Amino acid sequence: DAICSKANELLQRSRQVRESLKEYQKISNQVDLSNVCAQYRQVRFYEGVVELSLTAAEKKDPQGLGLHFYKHGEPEEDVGLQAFQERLNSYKCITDTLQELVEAGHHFEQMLKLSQRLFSIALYNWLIQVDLADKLLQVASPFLEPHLVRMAKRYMDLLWRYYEKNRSFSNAARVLSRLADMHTEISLQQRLEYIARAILSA
Amino acid sequence: FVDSTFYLLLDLITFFDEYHSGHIDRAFDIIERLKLVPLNQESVEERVAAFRNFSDEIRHNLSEVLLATMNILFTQFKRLKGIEDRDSQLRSQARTLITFAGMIPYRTSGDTNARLVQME
């Protein structure tokens, strides 16, 4: 409450004009942060803001409760849904901020180079919606591989992504085979193109 | 037959002269003229069927034909700066070529290091 008001002031002084940034980092938490975030951005503080949002997300949850919630994915309390809903809001904030960026690289690499498996999975999901999916191939993140794998069964794009993703011939081929065999309607011409591709990987 | 292989060898050689010493664009044109390497579609396989048939002299030469193609193809298709830019072709060409190379690596010296030039 009062602390929050102080935080707004903390940033506000920073709006007028390194230190205030640090002071904000200390304060960071919740919804008021949304308004506060716009303020951080004013003096081009995109990169720091993301870590900020992420750290906050982790700070509330510590830790890994949401992951359990997803596993069940139950509508019931399960592990508590509340943690999940809360983080997503923060995640949306991170994505929302990412969009505004469009010195682009420094901001993005920060997000990717962070250890958060719901975050990245969410990020990817965010990317697919954008049809950013091609960019996905590029992402190095160790989180990415499991993301593709789990999602693997407009998933076809994910798979077109996947076989392409696998530099390795063997892995790539196995996927296209499944691609061809798959139960979603895909023309035979493509089914064969998959095989032609898969066979080539022989 | 004897003369034909002769001309092919000469054509390949002129390709060499112009390969390096610049003239990236010219090299593709000539290589395609050879009618050895699949520029078109996935007809890469027909290039397989017609491969074993190839005379011993040419069968040997193909290694460099490939990789010359993926080179010019690479350098020419250096991602440009800032309109009609059909990057797609000279891209499809690499693809068909790679499928080709993929099909005959065993019947080749053993350098599918086309891959190194292929990517960046």
From Swiss-Prot, chain A:
This is Nuclear pore complex protein Nup155. Phosphorylated. Phosphorylation and dephosphorylation may be important for the function of NUP155 and may play a role in the reversible disassembly of the nuclear pore complex during mitosis. Essential component of nuclear pore complex. Could be essessential for embryogenesis. Nucleoporins may be involved both in binding and translocating proteins during nucleocytoplasmic transport. The modification Phosphoserine is found at residue 141. It comes from Homo sapiens. The lineage of its organism: Eukaryota, Metazoa, Chordata, Craniata, Vertebrata. Expressed in all tissues tested, including heart, brain, placenta, lung, liver, skeletal muscle, kidney and pancreas. It is linked to Atrial fibrillation, familial, 15: A familial form of atrial fibrillation, a common sustained cardiac rhythm disturbance. Atrial fibrillation is characterized by disorganized atrial electrical activity and ineffective atrial contraction promoting blood stasis in the atria and reduces ventricular filling. It can result in palpitations, syncope, thromboembolic stroke, and congestive heart failure. Interacts with GLE1. Able to form a heterotrimer with GLE1 and NUP42 in vitro. Forms a complex with NUP35, NUP93, NUP205 and lamin B. The chain holds residues 871 to 1125 of 1391 of the full protein. It is found in: Nucleus, Nuclear pore complex; Nucleus membrane. Belongs to the non-repetitive/WGA-negative nucleoporin family.
From Swiss-Prot, chain B:
It is found in: Nucleus membrane; Nucleus, Nuclear pore complex; Nucleus envelope. It comes from the Eukaryota. Transmembrane segments: none annotated. It is linked to Nephrotic syndrome 12: A form of nephrotic syndrome, a renal disease clinically characterized by severe proteinuria, resulting in complications such as hypoalbuminemia, hyperlipidemia and edema. Kidney biopsies show non-specific histologic changes such as focal segmental glomerulosclerosis and diffuse mesangial proliferation. Some affected individuals have an inherited steroid-resistant form and progress to end-stage renal failure. NPHS12 inheritance is autosomal recessive. Plays a role in the nuclear pore complex (NPC) assembly and/or maintenance. May anchor nucleoporins, but not NUP153 and TPR, to the NPC. During renal development, regulates podocyte migration and proliferation through SMAD4 signaling. Part of the nuclear pore complex (NPC). Component of the p62 complex, a complex composed of NUP62 and NUP54. Forms a complex with NUP35, NUP155, NUP205 and lamin B; the interaction with NUP35 is direct. Does not interact with TPR. Interacts with SMAD4 and IPO7; translocates SMAD4 to the nucleus through the NPC upon BMP7 stimulation resulting in activation of SMAD4 signaling. (Microbial infection) Interacts with SARS-CoV translation inhibitor nsp1; this interaction may disrupt nuclear pore function. This is Nuclear pore complex protein Nup93. It comes from Homo sapiens (Human). The gene is NUP93. The chain holds residues 684 to 815 of 819 of the full protein.
